[PDB]
Amino acid sequence: VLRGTVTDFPGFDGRADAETLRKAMKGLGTDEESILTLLTSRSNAQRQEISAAFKTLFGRDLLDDLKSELTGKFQKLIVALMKPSRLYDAYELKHALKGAGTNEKVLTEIIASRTPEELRAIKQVYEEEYGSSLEDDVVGDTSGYYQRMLVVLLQANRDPDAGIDEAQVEQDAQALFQAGELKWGTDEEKFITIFGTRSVSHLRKVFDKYMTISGFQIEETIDRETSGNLEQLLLAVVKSIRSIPAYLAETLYYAMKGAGTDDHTLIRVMVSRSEIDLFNIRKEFRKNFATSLYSMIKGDTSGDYKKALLLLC
Ligand SMILES: [Ca+2]
Ligand SMILES: [Ca+2]
Ligand SMILES: [Ca+2]
Ligand SMILES: [Ca+2]
Ligand SMILES: [Ca+2]
């Protein structure tokens, strides 16, 4: 079931790759074609071995070098690829929080689409890395029921997929129905517990029972794919309970639709899911948007930044 687009390069030699990269950057200029094609055909653990090998051979730091040589969206994309996989979501989360304001989009996206296993690991790396708790930094930045629901999801304690209790499926479908009709503005406490704590197989049966009660799908009610942090989060959780590859396909779609490109979302999803389910996200994208992701990127992006995203894709 989950398939990535980037795997370990067979016949890898970290020293040989350290030398190619050194050659590509040494002296006047920069060979971006060579950097781009090597780093998108190596997996993230191999990139860490190349950095190690580059410091042993040359006494230089590879990422600081990539950063002085490269520029703009291509530099942002190569810097993201060099981030150890284990640290990347934690990094993104620290940067949505830190500073004035907060970037709610990244906050909703990663806490709603990551599994409990991913989240236990994220919370642990964040503390170790940044010295504060993710939970505390979230409570310091967010407010109201949006804050509460983030904290519920950050406990990473959803019920197990086990005994499906239809009395409880019926009860909960009813409550969501009643909450939906009231525009998710009334028994917040009641519904936040159902969305953050029930098992995924229970909630899929609930969403189906909601359908037969209302005549429609629950995202039609929460649908205002714009405005209000908790509703955006309710929509991201519902879509992710249904299919995380489908929900990330859609956030990709919407990063490129309209005037502009949200390149930050486009790098973040492309890089974070490259070795997990980016293949699944590709199939979902074509299936729901009747265009491949490749072609959507190709029309939306330019230069070596485009060359590198199309090789990851
Ligand atoms: Ca140079
Ligand atoms: Ca050049
Ligand atoms: Ca350069
Ligand atoms: Ca902040
Ligand atoms: Ca666009």
Separation between Cα atoms, residue 278 and residue 270, nearest integer Å: 7
Q: Which one of the ligands is nearest to 104 CA? A: 4
DSSP letters spanning 221-286: HH--SSS-HHHHHHHHHHHHHH-HHHHHHHHHHHHHSSSS--HHHHHHHHHHHTTTTHHHHHHHHH
Which structure tokens are listed for 22? 């050194």
Which structure tokens are listed for 40? 């998108």
Distance 18 CA to ligand 1 centre (A): 15
Q: What value does the CA radius of gyration of the chain take, rounded to a whole number of Å?
A: 21
The last residue of a domain, from among 157, 188, 216: 157
Q: Which of 52, 51, 56 is nearest to 66 (CA)?
A: 51
The distance from CA 169 to its chain's CA centroid, rounded to whole angstroms, is 29
The distance from CA 270 to its chain's CA centroid, rounded to whole angstroms, is 8
Distance 257 CA to ligand 5 centre (A): 5
DSSP letters spanning 41-91: SS-HHHHHHHHHHHHHHHS--HHHHHHHH--HHHHHHHHHHHS-HHHHHHH
Which structure tokens are listed for 109? 């996206």
Q: Are residues 164 and 239 both part of a single domain? A: yes
Helix H, strand E, coil C: the string for 166-210 is: HHHHHHHHHHHHHHHHCCCCCCHHHHHHHHHHCCHHHHHHHHHHH
Helix (H) or strand (E) holding 129: helix 116-130
Distance 149 CA to ligand 4 centre (A): 18
Distance 309 CA to ligand 4 centre (A): 30
Task: Classify residue 6: in a domain, yes or no.
Answer: no
Other beta carbons within 10 angstroms of residue 274's beta carbon come to 22
Distance 19 CA to ligand 5 centre (A): 38
Task: Classify residue 217: in a domain, yes or no.
Answer: yes
Task: Classify residue 165: in a domain, yes or no.
Answer: yes
Q: Experimentally, how was this structure solved?
A: X-ray
The last residue of a domain, from among 228, 243, 258: 243
Structure resolution, Å: 2.0
Task: Classify residue 3: in a domain, yes or no.
Answer: no
Distance 288 CA to ligand 2 centre (A): 38
Name the phi and psi angles at 70, rounded to 5. -110, 160
Task: Classify residue 106: in a domain, yes or no.
Answer: yes
Q: Are residues 173 and 238 both part of a single domain? A: yes
Number of domains in the chain: 4
**Contact assessment for residue 14 and residue 49, using Cβ atoms and an 8 Å cutoff:** yes
The last residue of a domain, from among 157, 174, 199: 157
Q: Are residues 147 and 199 both part of a single domain? A: no
Distance 24 CA to ligand 1 centre (A): 7
Other beta carbons within 10 angstroms of residue 61's beta carbon come to 12
- Residue numbers of the domain that contains 110: 84-157
CATH number at residue 171: 1.10.220.10
